Design an enzyme around this catalytic site. Sequence first.
Site, PDB file in Angstrom:
ATOM      1  N   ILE A  72       0.867  -1.167   0.000  1.00 51.18           N
ATOM      2  CA  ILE A  72       0.000   0.000   0.000  1.00 51.18           C
ATOM      3  C   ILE A  72       0.911   1.227   0.000  1.00 51.18           C
ATOM      4  O   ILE A  72       1.829   1.332   0.821  1.00 51.18           O
ATOM      5  CB  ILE A  72      -0.928  -0.008   1.251  1.00 51.18           C
ATOM      6  CG1 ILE A  72      -1.911  -1.192   1.140  1.00 51.18           C
ATOM      7  CG2 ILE A  72      -1.646   1.340   1.402  1.00 51.18           C
ATOM      8  CD1 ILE A  72      -3.000  -1.219   2.217  1.00 51.18           C
ATOM      9  N   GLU A 160      -2.117  -8.808   3.163  1.00 51.69           N
ATOM     10  CA  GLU A 160      -1.637 -10.112   3.643  1.00 51.69           C
ATOM     11  C   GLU A 160      -2.669 -11.234   3.427  1.00 51.69           C
ATOM     12  O   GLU A 160      -2.299 -12.375   3.158  1.00 51.69           O
ATOM     13  CB  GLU A 160      -1.236 -10.024   5.121  1.00 51.69           C
ATOM     14  CG  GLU A 160      -0.151  -8.993   5.396  1.00 51.69           C
ATOM     15  CD  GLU A 160       1.241  -9.410   4.911  1.00 51.69           C
ATOM     16  OE1 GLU A 160       1.365 -10.335   4.081  1.00 51.69           O
ATOM     17  OE2 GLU A 160       2.217  -8.784   5.359  1.00 51.69           O
ATOM     18  N   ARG A 163      -2.416 -12.511  -0.005  1.00 47.93           N
ATOM     19  CA  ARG A 163      -1.225 -13.336  -0.216  1.00 47.93           C
ATOM     20  C   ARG A 163      -1.341 -14.757   0.348  1.00 47.93           C
ATOM     21  O   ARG A 163      -0.743 -15.684  -0.195  1.00 47.93           O
ATOM     22  CB  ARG A 163       0.006 -12.686   0.429  1.00 47.93           C
ATOM     23  CG  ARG A 163       0.490 -11.398  -0.226  1.00 47.93           C
ATOM     24  CD  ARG A 163       1.557 -10.731   0.631  1.00 47.93           C
ATOM     25  NE  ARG A 163       2.082  -9.505   0.035  1.00 47.93           N
ATOM     26  CZ  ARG A 163       2.419  -8.428   0.737  1.00 47.93           C
ATOM     27  NH1 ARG A 163       2.274  -8.425   2.058  1.00 47.93           N
ATOM     28  NH2 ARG A 163       2.889  -7.351   0.120  1.00 47.93           N
TER      29      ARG A 163
END
Length: 247
Positions: A72, A160, A163
């Site tokens: 970000i 996250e 991911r």
Amino acid sequence: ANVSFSLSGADSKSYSKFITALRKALPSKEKVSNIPLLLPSASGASRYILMQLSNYDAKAITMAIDVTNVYIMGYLVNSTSYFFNESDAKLASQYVFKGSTIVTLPYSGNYERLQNAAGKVREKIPLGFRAFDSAITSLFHYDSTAAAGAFLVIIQTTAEASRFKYIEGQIIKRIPKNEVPSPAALSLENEWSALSKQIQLAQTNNGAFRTPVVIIDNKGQRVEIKDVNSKVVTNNIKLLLNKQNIA
Ligand SMILES: *[C@@H]1O[C@H](CO)[C@@H](O)[C@H](O)[C@H]1NC(C)=O
Ligand SMILES: *[C@@H]1O[C@H](CO)[C@@H](O)[C@H](O)[C@H]1NC(C)=O
Ligand SMILES: *[C@@H]1O[C@H](CO)[C@@H](O)[C@H](O)[C@H]1NC(C)=O
């Protein structure tokens, strides 16, 4: 925005659909061991996707994400944008939220810096729907003393989770009540680039990692991942950092 999510009326399915949309919004020219490989590089505006987030009261902010690493860069609220104090965010500010008043934040976006700024380590920052709502509100009014902590919450809840399936799962378990993440979740966050690198190297090493990756499991035990047949590779990691952006 390329992707957006609203907490009002959201449940576990609307959250999962959002995370799936985030994963698909990231460009990728190929898969490695069945996992999308992120681009080695991108230029101009095409290097960023925009993610819109709205809290329970329908207040919204738009965040810019660098597609090469899912980091970000900053965000926009009203007509003012806020970017992390680091070279990649400085560059991003030349291509997104054009026309807004650019404010540079007093810290960069990596975890060590944010934890110091917030005065609290990731192990002690609760995650969940209410925490997410609270983090968006802090950024919407730019409460400077709560922003670092708010970024810690949002990054783990979006980037996250995109991911790792396990982290997406952690947020879902925290929908009814906020709770600090497990040590296993934080371990995966820290080893994402190492895992990404080994999976790519494994391709010319008959599936075996050149160097084992060490994480801790749900039971708090040290565990070694040394090949692409591991459950962490077949059913957990969902995006790979391109090796050209590692070492
Ligand atoms: C993201 O949205 C922008 C703005 O409409 C568009 O130009 C760009 O192609 C989109 N990027 C991707 C890969 O979805
Ligand atoms: C950004 O960091 C640099 C040092 O890397 C510092 O000189 C500068 O004052 C910082 N700017 C802000 C907005 O804090
Ligand atoms: C954006 O505008 C809204 C509505 O006036 C206000 O409540 C909020 O504090 C503003 N955000 C910032 C950071 O100025």
